[PDB]
């Protein structure tokens, strides 16, 4: 409710300063108690950073800030109540913003692990994620009203560059800590980091996202290949190793729920630009998400491992989908459903990129490939089927719809008819066909009356089973 500048003024300011500085000083201590209590302290500190009216990380520019005790109170005041006479002297243990970002970048490039940087992940990063956004609005690069902008200098110096660097480094960290068996900090880091993704620059995709999703997709492929081999060999020894591939599935799901909530927002901000000006990087990301969704649809273990992760960690996924509405401020089936699943949600979000890949005339070929996938032909098989059945490709003169669709297709800047080549058509068509097929299979599972547990006999006769 933006109450901070009116509530946290002089003595509340001092109390919040003390709380902030104590929680930060707690980082050096190492104890089992600290390990358990650090998350709550980090959340409290993040909310405090979001509420505070002053920029404790940027003290040098305090004089411009008006909601500060140093400005509101005379120097003769702040003597009766113990003050150091300097915002810097308030509590130096907190470093400046630049120093913290340099540290975080060093940790990320080094490959530091949660054991070496537990304080950062659980306290500092949330605090920055709540600090930077607030000060971006009140600092330069913000939408300036004429008079308010022209007169007082902005106290904060935060720009979108800070947020982009922080987001890259946070990723950058997750990828260093991907394989680990136990990572509970990932889900909290994601929820704290989501807000700063709106300012994310386009280059972040190629720089960070593509390798991450590629590594996860490769791991998923290895896991499903294992599962296939374990199937192939059918024993009690096959039941053994099922738990191993299970654990691989669970860690994969954990990493996915860590990374995706950020990607969804980055996608949401850049769908318009990706659809207006075609982007090969976006198309590659689409291929990746489609492959992951195909693996999800094919493997039963992966789906239920995902369900288990969500229910056990009490992930809502409501927040990930609707943080746009949240910033707006305006039973088990709901508690978790496939439509909630981040995998399918991301796939649906990026599918229009896939359709933009495809020419409207290719739609018929897409339908044929989608029926072949229902026949359970392989990817190469549908590829060659499209290759030899290319003649079927649609003809615009027959139907007016294709005419106005071609109009826009050519209207796309980067698209030219020379770029289109039979390999391109077959590859894109079968990709989108597989995606669409598995999408309909997910949407209409036909789960109805399969494994009924309405227990009508025992409900009508409960006494007799007892």
């Amino acid at each position: 409710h933006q109450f901070g500048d009116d509530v946290i003024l002089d003595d509340v300011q001092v109390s919040c300063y003390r709380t902030l500085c104590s929680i930060y000083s707690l980082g050096t201590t190492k104890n089992t108690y600290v390990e358990k209590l650090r998350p709550a302290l980090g959340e409290c500190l993040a909310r405090l950073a979001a509420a505070m009216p002053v920029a404790f990380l940027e003290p040098q520019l305090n004089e411009y800030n008006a909601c500060s005790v140093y400005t509101t109170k005379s120097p003769r005041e702040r003597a009766i109540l113990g003050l150091p006479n300097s915002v810097e002297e308030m509590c130096p243990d907190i470093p400046v913003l630049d120093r913290l970002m340099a540290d975080i970048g060093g940790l990320a490039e080094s490959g530091a692990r949660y054991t070496e940087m537990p304080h950062v992940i659980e306290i500092t990063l949330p605090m920055l994620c709540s600090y930077l956004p607030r000060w971006w609005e009140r600092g330069p690069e913000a939408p300036p009203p004429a008079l308010p902008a022209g007169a007082p200098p902005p106290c904060t110096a935060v720009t979108s560059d800070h947020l982009n660097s922080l987001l890259g480094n946070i990723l950058r960290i997750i990828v260093n800590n991907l394989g680990i068996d136990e990572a509970t900090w990932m889900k909290r880091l994601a929820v704290f980091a989501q807000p700063i993704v709106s300012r994310a620059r386009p280059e972040l995709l190629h720089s960070h996202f593509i390798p991450t999703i590629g590594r996860l997709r490769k791991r998923a492929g290895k896991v499903v290949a294992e599962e296939e081999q374990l199937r192939l060999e059918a024993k009690a020894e096959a039941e053994e190793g099922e738990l191993l591939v299970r654990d691989e599935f669970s860690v994969l799901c954990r990493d996915l729920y860590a990374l995706y909530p950020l990607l969804i927002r980055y996608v949401d901000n850049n769908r318009a630009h990706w659809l207006t000006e075609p982007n090969a990087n976006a198309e590659e990301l689409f291929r990746m998400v489609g492959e992951i969704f195909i693996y999800w649809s094919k493997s039963h273990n992966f789906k239920r491992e995902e369900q288990n992760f969500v229910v056990q960690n009490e992930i809502n996924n409501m927040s990930f989908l609707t943080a746009d509405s949240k910033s707006k401020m305006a039973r088990r089936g709901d508690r978790y459903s496939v439509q909630t699943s981040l995998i399918v949600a991301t796939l649906k979000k990026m599918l229009p990129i896939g359709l933009n890949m495809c020419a409207p005339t290719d739609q018929d070929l897409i339908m044929l490939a989608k029926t072949r996938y229902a026949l359970k032909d392989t990817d190469e098989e549908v590829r060659e089927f499209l290759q030899n059945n290319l003649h079927l490709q649609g003809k615009v003169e027959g139907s007016p719809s294709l005419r106005w669709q071609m109009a826009l297709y050519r209207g796309l800047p980067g698209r030219e008819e020379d770029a289109d080549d039979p390999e391109k058509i077959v590859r894109r068509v079968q990709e989108v066909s597989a995606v669409l097929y598995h999408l309909e299979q997910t949407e209409h599972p036909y789960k109805s009356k399969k494994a009924v547990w309405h227990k009508l006999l025992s409900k009508q006769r409960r006494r007799a089973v007892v």
């Binding site: 769908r271 318009a272 659809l275 305006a330 909630t340 599918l351 359709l355 106005w404 826009l408 209207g411």
Partner: protein
């Protein structure tokens, strides 16, 4: 009997933003003058003669909508009882042309100059042609609203408004006491030429649909300060008012001195002299007598508001911060002012709002007092004429003066808080303005029913130029114009202003737009869903639902629809040109949705809700009103009875009901020069016809009006009384007075039941039933009324060829309300004979099926013209005035109902 067809030209009306009227306590002047100079006129650019009329029109009621209307269309000045015009040869009012005599009498031609004069006291409207008198006048007309200059024209015209001063140079001197109309431009606005009640305009990308326009009222100019007549002041406030007067005079002195004024033995505007500056006591008794009452009014208002003022701290009075004007500074007094220094004093926003309201009241009190003296408003200041650019209530006041008064009074409050008197702000008290009617507020635009889609995926866009009340979505072909979108099941819409989704009620959904935003409305009839997007972003409910509505039933189908409130502007793109769709590619194209008009050669035809009341048959299934056709007996004649179905029940609808009979009686073209058995020769040679209305016991006659209405009655007034009836008098005399004719025109001829109710101190309810009879002679144009067989004093005279419908206006107070009795008195024929040629000579009363009760409905659907007249408005120069030009013709085929005289 058969519908008639003819080709008619489109007509358009243009006015300056000049609005003048008469009201008690009004700050406005009464007499006004303007001129129109014709430059080019094409007599016949089409088969129909060119239309050019100049005159005055009333803000409330003059709604000439493009296309069809009264008579054969071409509605302009003088085609209704709200407008008064002159074409060069005739005076126009009530869609009737009455010849008027002028030297060199001719139809408006190039180089002609028409001088129009309005006196609101008489009231009277007069004209001069090329400086020559026009021997006719409009008078005795309604003053319910504000009058503005207006010109109605067809294609083939160039004209110039001359309003006075810089905005136009008069060619003929205005008559004494008649102010130029340029003096009426309000401080906040600037003079301009605008259309009247437009629902459509052009804009960069395309047409913009426009909602209703907020308009002023004659009462708004009347200042209405809070009542203070019971002026009681606590003693501590009686002493301090004079000190407040001294200090405000002191602050006035500061304003003058920093403005550069100097000590003045005599006050004068240009000289920069003010006798007030000199000292707090030396300041003259006239100014004290002026401003002491003002301080008293301020204190009494503080009391009225409920604020409690008392001596909170004697120390504040005893000791106070002594402000010191810089010793360097110098003034003509020689005596440095000392207002209370109050940098250590904080006034809260509540007190700021109270300051605003008190400044409003102070300005309004000044205005009422100065008006009582006799001053008036004028954009140009004239003291001898007693005209000021500030005799206008605070709301219309300019921001500069608003700020000046606000600051002065805020410092007054600051001085009071320095005195330390406590300030208790009153609790906020909400109120409802009720500026416009329910129907006059909202305008609905929908696609034509023929474009109904029962299948597929469809997309369209609605750009909001404003951030106010607008709703956009999909509607069923039976959407009622009167109902607000989404209140019923007929529409599924989105209202961004509050972020709501409407269908059978309001639910939160989506976020408000900002100016320039585009809402994409999508309908999928395969999946039976409706989707809304904002700037390419799919709006979501307060949940994970990506769809506003689900489980829709296709049924008859769906149509694109929008509604605009007052002051609202939208742009509806249905996709005829896909390239113009900004957000289709981002959302919808890949999803498979198609533009609504993707492959249509012509733009989608639209219909709009028109708030022009028209008479329609009572639906048989109307929940609240029933009409029973009674067959005639030996003792009783044929009858039509009205019954309230929901009387004495919760959900009962009790509102004034306007009813007529479907068929009129027409007066002859030429009027003649000048034991209860009908005598055959009398009853066959008579030209008199009769009907009656029975008000049943329990229905208050005071809530009943009985008589006739012309086919131009369009007034749906909940608070109806006979004074609201439109009226005008056209008076024609020779060159020098000697009025040779005076004709009274009105749409409504009625008598009030109160006039026949005997005065009773008690026992107003009567077991008896009141039988009001109405008689009309179709050869003398005479209309008479009877109460219960006793002749009423009321009588009307109407011109030949007049069409009159039997009408009853009633406020129901009983289950059984009224009974049309289509019977006869002795030697008087029934209405059937007049209505039907076959029965001209049939004395037998009868009620054929065509005769039916019609009820006034406020709103009706109307087709939007595909093309609109292109009018060029400009300011030619200071001398030349403002210029209006229309050169390109437009024609429409008109279907004319003879009995209703509408097209």
């Amino acid at each position: 009997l058969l519908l008639q067809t003819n080709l008619i030209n489109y007509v358009t009306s243009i006015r300056p933003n000049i609005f003048v009227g008469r009201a008690e306590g009004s700050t406005q002047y009464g007499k006004w003058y303007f001129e129109v100079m014709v430059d080019e006129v094409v007599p016949f650019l089409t088969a129909q003669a060119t239309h050019l009329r100049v005159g005055w029109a009333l803000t409330e009621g003059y709604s000439p909508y493009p296309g069809g209307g009264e008579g054969w269309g071409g509605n302009g000045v003088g085609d209704d009882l709200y407008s008064y015009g002159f074409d060069g040869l005739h005076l126009w009012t009530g869609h009737v042309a009455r010849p008027v005599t002028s030297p060199g009498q001719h139809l408006l031609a190039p180089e002609d100059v028409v001088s129009c004069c309005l006196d609101l006291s008489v009231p009277s409207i007069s004209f001069r042609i090329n400086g020559c008198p026009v021997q006719g006048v409009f008078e005795a007309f309604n003053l319910d609203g504000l009058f503005f200059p207006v010109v109605s024209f067809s294609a083939g015209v160039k004209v110039r408004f001359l309003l006075g001063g810089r905005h136009g140079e008069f060619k003929f001197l205005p008559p004494p006491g008649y102010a130029p109309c340029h003096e009426a431009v309000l401080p906040r606005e600037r003079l301009r030429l605008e259309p009247i009640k437009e629902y459509r305009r052009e804009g960069p990308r395309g047409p913009h649909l426009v909602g209703p326009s907020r308009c002023l009222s004659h009462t708004d100019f009347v200042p209405c300060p809070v009542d203070t007549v019971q002026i009681v002041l606590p003693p501590h406030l009686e002493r301090i008012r004079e000190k407040l007067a001294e200090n405000i005079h002191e602050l006035w002195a500061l304003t003058r001195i920093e403005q550069g004024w100097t000590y003045g033995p005599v006050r004068d505007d240009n000289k920069r002299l003010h006798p007030c500056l000199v000292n707090f006591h030396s300041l003259p008794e006239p100014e004290r007598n002026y401003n002491l009452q003002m301080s008293g009014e301020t204190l009494k208002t503080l009391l009225a508001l409920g604020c409690h003022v008392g001596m909170a701290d004697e120390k504040a009075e005893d000791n106070l911060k002594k402000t010191k004007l810089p010793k360097t500074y110098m003034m003509s007094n020689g005596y440095k002012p000392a207002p209370l220094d109050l940098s250590h004093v904080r006034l809260t926003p509540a007190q700021t709002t109270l300051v605003d309201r008190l400044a409003e009241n102070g300005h309004n009190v000044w205005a009422r007092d100065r008006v009582a003296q006799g001053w008036s408003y004028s954009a140009v200041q004239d003291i001898p004429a007693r005209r000021n650019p500030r005799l206008v209530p605070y709301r219309l006041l300019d921001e500069a003066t608003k700020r000046s008064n606000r600051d002065s009074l805020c410092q007054a409050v600051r001085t009071l808080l320095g005195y330390g008197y406590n300030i208790e702000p009153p609790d906020q008290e909400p109120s409802q303005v009720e500026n416009q009617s329910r129907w006059d507020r909202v305008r609905i635009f929908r696609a034509e029913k023929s474009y109904t889609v029962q299948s597929g995926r469809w997309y369209f866009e609605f750009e909001a130029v404003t951030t106010g009340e607008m709703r956009v979505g999909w509607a069923r072909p039976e959407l009622r114009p009167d109902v607000e979108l989404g209140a019923d099941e007929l529409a599924y819409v989105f209202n961004g202003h509050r972020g709501q989704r409407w269908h059978l009620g309001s639910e939160p959904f989506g976020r408000p737009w900002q100016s320039g935003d585009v809402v994409g409305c999508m309908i999928d009839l395969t999946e039976n869903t409706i989707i809304f997007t904002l700037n390419g972003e799919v709006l979501m409910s307060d949940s994970g639902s990506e769809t506003a509505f689900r489980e829709i039933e296709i049924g008859d189908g769906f149509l694109p629809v929008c509604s605009l409130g007052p002051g609202q502007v939208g742009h509806l793109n249905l996709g005829q040109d896909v390239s113009s769709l900004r957000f289709f590619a981002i959302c919808g194209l890949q999803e498979g949705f198609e533009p609504f008009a993707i492959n249509m050669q012509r733009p989608v035809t639209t219909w709009f809700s028109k708030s022009l009341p028209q008479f329609e048959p009572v639906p048989p299934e109307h929940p609240h009103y029933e009409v029973a056709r009674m067959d005639g007996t030996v003792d009783t004649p044929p009858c039509l009875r009205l019954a309230h179905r929901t009387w004495g029940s919760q959900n009962s609808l009790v509102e004034m009901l306007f009813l007529r009979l479907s068929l009129p009686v027409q007066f002859h073209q030429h009027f003649r020069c000048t034991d209860n058995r009908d005598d055959p020769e009398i009853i066959l040679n008579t030209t008199t016809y009769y009907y009656s209305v029975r008000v049943f016991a329990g229905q208050e006659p005071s809530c009943v009006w009985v008589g006739w209405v012309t086919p131009d009655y369009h007034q749906h007034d909940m608070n109806f009384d006979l004074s609201k009836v439109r009226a005008v008098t056209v008076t024609m005399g020779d060159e020098q007075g000697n009025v040779h004719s005076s004709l009274k025109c009105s749409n409504c001829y009625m008598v009030w039941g109160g006039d026949f109710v005997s005065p009773g101190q008690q026992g107003r309810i009567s077991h008896t039933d009141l039988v009001i009879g109405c008689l009309v002679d179709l050869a003398t144009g005479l209309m008479t009324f009877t109460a219960n067989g006793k002749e009423s004093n009321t009588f009307f005279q109407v011109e030949p060829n007049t069409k009159l419908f039997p009408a009853v206006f009633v406020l129901p107070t009983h289950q059984n309300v009224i009974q049309f009795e289509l019977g006869k008195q002795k030697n008087i024929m029934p209405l059937s004979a007049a209505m039907f040629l076959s029965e001209r000579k049939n004395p037998a009363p009868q009620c054929p099926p065509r005769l039916e009760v019609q009820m006034l409905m406020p709103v009706s659907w109307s087709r939007m013209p595909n093309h609109f007249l292109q009018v060029e408005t400009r300011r030619a120069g200071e001398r030349l005035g403002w210029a209006v030009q229309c050169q390109d013709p437009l024609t429409m085929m008109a279907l004319h109902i003879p009995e209703e005289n509408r097209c």
